[PDB]
Amino acid sequence: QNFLSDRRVIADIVEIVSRTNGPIIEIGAGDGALTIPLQRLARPLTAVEVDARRARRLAQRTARSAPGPASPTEVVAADFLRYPLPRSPHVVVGNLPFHLTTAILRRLLHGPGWTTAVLLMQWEVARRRAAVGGATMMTAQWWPWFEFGLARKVSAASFTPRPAVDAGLLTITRRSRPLVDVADRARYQALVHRVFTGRGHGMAQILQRLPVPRTWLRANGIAPNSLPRQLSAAQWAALFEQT
Ligand SMILES: Nc1ncnc2c1ncn2[C@@H]1O[C@H](C[C@@H](N)CC[C@H](N)C(=O)O)[C@@H](O)[C@H]1O
Secondary structure (H helix, E strand, O other), rough: OOEEOOOOHHHHHHHHHOOOOOOOOEEEEOOOOOOOHHHHHOOEEEEEOOOHHHHHHHHHHHHHHHOOOOOOEEEEEHHHHHHHOOOOOOOEEEEEEOOOOOHHHHHHHOOOOOOEEEEEEEEEHHHHHHHOOOOOOOHHHHHEEEEEEEEEEEEEEEEHHOOOOEEEEEEEOOOOOOOHHHHHHHHHHHHHHHHHOOOOOOHHHHHOOOOOOOOOOOOOOOOOOOHHHHHHHHHHHHHHHHH
């Protein structure tokens, strides 16, 4: 496991979390590198840590730095993949174990209540999720319900011990107005898969060899030679409504 040792990254994450509202849930709290600074935001906090011995040590540390028994942070010894997320508004934050990143992201994207997620993960994953240099199939598949932001790059030297690759700080925000109804999620995500894996050179050829009016692409501001990665969230949703 790679614990966050760079205090500047801690300050940066706390700065982003401080601009949000409501209760906070932290994934992989560890020794409390983020938990202790997050508790000073005076908001309700739940810190999740799968190592029970480490979770008990963290519960003592959070209580010691808290105003006292009468006033704070609940430390839960649990696997976040099995943790029931509340359906009420909350904010999620975490330094994710790099081998469980996509499973944790899947669990969060299908989960309720949370309005913002502030997550530390592998740099290549955070880059693809934030659509740096164009969107990937997974980003476009979640775009009607969420927005992704790349806050910063984080060197492997900012962790102890050092991971094999660098990291990225990713923000995710739940759209208050979804672009596609959640009931149509599986058909929407199937269409996005079909376009990213379809044969053809460019959108005009891809949409031809697929099970769309020929005037549709240019009327929606899409160049016929464009690649699926160049489409915006609004264009994917218009394509879903069309098909
Ligand atoms: N599935 C899980 N659910 C909740 N915690 C996890 C899970 N898997 C790993 N853990 C913990 O996730 C943490 C991930 C670490 N990269 C960071 C820990 C901590 N925030 C620190 O920076 O001090 C480790 O403390 C792991 O023990």
